[PDB]
Amino acid sequence: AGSIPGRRS
Amino acid sequence: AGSIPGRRS
Amino acid sequence: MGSMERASLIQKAKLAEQAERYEDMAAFMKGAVEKGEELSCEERNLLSVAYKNVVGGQRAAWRVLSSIEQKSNGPEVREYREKVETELQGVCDTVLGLLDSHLIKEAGDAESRVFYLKMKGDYYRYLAEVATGDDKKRIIDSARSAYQEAMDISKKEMPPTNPIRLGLALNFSVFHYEIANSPEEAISLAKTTFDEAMADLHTLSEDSYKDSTLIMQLLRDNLTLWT
Amino acid sequence: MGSMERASLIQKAKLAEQAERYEDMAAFMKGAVEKGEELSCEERNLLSVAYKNVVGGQRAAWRVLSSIEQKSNGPEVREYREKVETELQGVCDTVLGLLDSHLIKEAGDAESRVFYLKMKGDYYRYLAEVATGDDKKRIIDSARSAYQEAMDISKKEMPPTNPIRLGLALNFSVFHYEIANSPEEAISLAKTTFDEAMADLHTLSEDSYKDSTLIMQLLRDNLTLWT
Ligand SMILES: *Cc1ccc(C(=O)NCc2nccn2C)cc1
Ligand SMILES: *Cc1ccc(C(=O)NCc2nccn2C)cc1
Ligand SMILES: [Ca+2]
Ligand SMILES: [Ca+2]
Ligand SMILES: [Cl-]
Ligand SMILES: [Cl-]
Ligand SMILES: [Cl-]
Ligand SMILES: [Cl-]
């Protein structure tokens, strides 16, 4: 299950 | 130009 | 980072992201937060991106080591898993400390308050992933409480397509499925979030449409995996 | 890492590689080296893999920042490039210190001595990549001298298909092309290395054949890029 990737601005 | 990758044992 | 200008810390955080130096980026943004001023929308994103990458590397390593540890059951694998786990908990505690001192209490707008409360839920969720003993239930409830307050504000103050509202619902649904052992609540939240966003897409510009549909696809990906 | 057993340091270095925690891996192998015993073939590889990953991340970040700095020509980009550069130089100095105290002087076999001298050439080459001022020429000569001693031993003591001999020649050729401004020497070395290995492949087992041809392909890739 994927949370928000949120690794790139 | 590539040197030896050498990042995996 | 007390001796560096706030603007220089922000500039170097952006440079560190370009260089994929996320530990530096997090330290720069921690320094910026500790200047005591509120954060702009862009600055909040830099803070979140920096720590998500740092904790993401720690979580990935913890899962590798925990898996090796379970297959074995000397003390080395447990000892090293414990070391990584302690470092992960320190990062989560640092982020939670920044939110508590004093980002959340000074966040009055919906966009900032929901953003920070979602962060609070996320980093308690990461603590819950590695928690076992006396406090795992209390950590889980701390995550749920932060997510719930953010949900309540986002339903009152934001349109159903708002990317922060969508990402909050996505992560709260992952919390339900992976942490709280409530897969039905996870599926129901993801479904209702997706359907209400679909019905609001007609109000959006071309660029906002792309932003919202990207996150709705993540909700759909999870529903496909869960059903 | 003075209080940890040598065997535990080696075991944790292998765990850190599986978890892609290369800073930890390097610290564990530094601790193992400082136990004072010579390193096995496998242990030498762990030392090399750990620091190659650490310095590789620093080199990639330095190139990103140096490129941004040249496009700009406040002090932030220069300051941050200098910080990354100083950290990179510290890592290179640490590796060179380990080779000098006392890995190289206790390395008597060709396989160990050539391996360490190639490392010495590599980490002086990384120093040369960022060097400008009074010492860039001396760093370049230190790299060349280490590579040259390793070449001399490998020609006397190793077959032309030996993967250490091939990788040494590959990196020395990259030194010639990228550092020493000698592209003709780079091309000549890569060509002669490839041809002499080709003529020795008939002596190898299926597994040794795969090991050697993989590195010969890297020599061919460079020749394709340089001609
Ligand atoms: C927690 C969270 C939610 C949403 C995102 C994201 O990627 N949003 C896209 C977007 N579109 C316009 C503005 N933003 C932030 C990231 C993290
Ligand atoms: C400096 C260097 C040279 C060669 C390699 C490599 O990948 N060798 C493959 C191999 N085959 C049998 C044993 N080894 C080490 C890495 C680094
Ligand atoms: Ca100021
Ligand atoms: Ca001992
Ligand atoms: Cl440990
Ligand atoms: Cl405010
Ligand atoms: Cl800096
Ligand atoms: Cl010896």
XYZ file of N, CA and C and ligand atoms in Angstrom, chain C residues 38 103-109 112, ligand 6:
28
model
N 6.957 31.598 10.955
C 6.109 30.627 10.281
C 6.691 30.305 8.905
N 5.363 24.892 15.405
C 4.740 25.058 14.094
C 3.221 24.949 14.177
N 2.719 23.942 14.890
C 1.284 23.677 14.869
C 0.522 24.790 15.583
N 0.995 25.199 16.762
C 0.242 26.189 17.524
C 0.197 27.543 16.830
N 1.166 27.849 15.975
C 1.108 29.097 15.231
C 0.471 28.940 13.859
N -0.051 27.767 13.519
C -0.640 27.541 12.200
C -2.144 27.784 12.282
N -2.601 28.887 11.692
C -4.004 29.257 11.759
C -4.793 28.992 10.492
N -4.138 29.090 9.340
C -4.806 28.812 8.082
C -4.991 27.315 7.898
N -2.005 25.421 6.205
C -0.840 25.154 7.043
C -1.176 24.195 8.175
Cl -0.338 32.179 12.286
